[PDB]
């Protein structure tokens, strides 16, 4: 309570910027799979976009949302340009990491971790 803002009087005016950013990403994906010759389909790129958006849907602080929008604009800059290579983009997909088992008994069969 009683804190300063950044770019957002409220959460709805932040969701506005969120949707602008989702839009820019949706319109950028077909150009990134083309310019640097990715070996994916546009469908799953945009699904990755929505996944990495819904990775942070629990948040309600406007300030956190604005900072996430800022970092999304940074990544979008890096991706619109080719400052980052196929390696960095396909880093999102985790095309080599085996799935962390989300089950008790598997974790018990391998490892002491919870």
């Amino acid at each position: 309570t009683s804190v300063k803002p950044i770019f957002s009087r409220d959460l709805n005016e932040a969701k506005r910027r969120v949707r602008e950013l989702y839009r820019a990403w949706y319109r950028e994906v077909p150009n990134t799979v083309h310019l640097m010759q990715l070996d994916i389909t546009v469908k799953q790129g945009r699904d990755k976009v929505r996944e990495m958006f819904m990775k942070n849907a629990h948040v309600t602080d406007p300030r956190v949302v604005d900072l996430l929008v800022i970092k999304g604009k940074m990544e979008l800059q890096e991706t619109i340009k080719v400052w980052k290579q196929r390696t960095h983009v396909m880093r999102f997909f985790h095309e080599t990491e085996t799935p962390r088992p989300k089950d008790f008994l598997s974790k018990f069969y391998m490892g002491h971790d919870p």
Binding site: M74, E75, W83
Partner: protein, 207 residues
């Protein structure tokens, strides 16, 4: 007179205390806690709203022509709720002197930028954003510099591990420099070196 210890003067101390009173009484809306150290390094501490006015003052004032930015650091102290102590080292070239302006911040209490005063602050503000996570208003670019492009994390934060959360290596299955999680063949050996004895009574914290 003692050889092993460092020589000591007083005129620099007095000059800098006088200039500290100067700034303190000329700029009271922002200034807190002027201080001068044993080694004579003047050190003014500032409310974050006062950044542009104070820096413009010290650049453009006649008796303070601090028109060269040497460093622009940040210091993470997790204890205090406003973690990041931000530092502005300056020099004059007219009086052959330095000064240090300080402010404070947090993860969600950013600060106005200084390219409107010192263009040298561009890449330093970018470095500070990258390393500690301090956003700077009305900055032209404000992207990373030093970290890799696909990099999550602000490394010089004290709560960040030295070794990181991702590691790189090439894979023939995909013919890319993939990023696997971190798994070291030799854990970094933390050493507990601090002695349990008060070495310096002058800095003794009372309870």
């Amino acid at each position: 007179k003692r050889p092993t210890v460092r020589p000591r003067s007083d005129v620099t101390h007095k000059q800098l205390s006088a200039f500290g009173e100067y700034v303190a009484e000329i700029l009271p809306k922002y200034v807190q806690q002027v201080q001068v150290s044993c080694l004579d390094e003047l050190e003014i501490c500032i409310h974050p709203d006062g950044v542009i006015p104070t820096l413009t003052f010290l650049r453009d004032h006649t008796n303070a022509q601090f028109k060269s930015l040497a460093d622009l650091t940040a210091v993470d102290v997790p204890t205090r709720q406003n973690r990041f102590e931000i530092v502005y080292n300056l020099l004059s070239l007219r009086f052959n002197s330095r000064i240090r302006v300080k402010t404070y911040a947090d993860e969600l209490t950013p600060i106005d930028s200084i390219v409107s005063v010192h263009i040298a602050a561009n890449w330093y503000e970018r470095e500070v954003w990258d390393m500690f996570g301090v956003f700077f208003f009305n900055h032209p670019d404000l992207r990373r510099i030093l970290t890799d492009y696909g990099f999550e994390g602000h490394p010089f934060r004290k709560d960040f591990p030295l070794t990181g959360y991702v590691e790189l290596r090439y894979d023939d299955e995909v013919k890319r420099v993939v990023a696997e999680p971190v798994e070291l063949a030799q854990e970094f050996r933390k050493f507990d070196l601090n002695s349990p004895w008060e070495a310096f009574p002058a800095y003794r914290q009372p309870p």
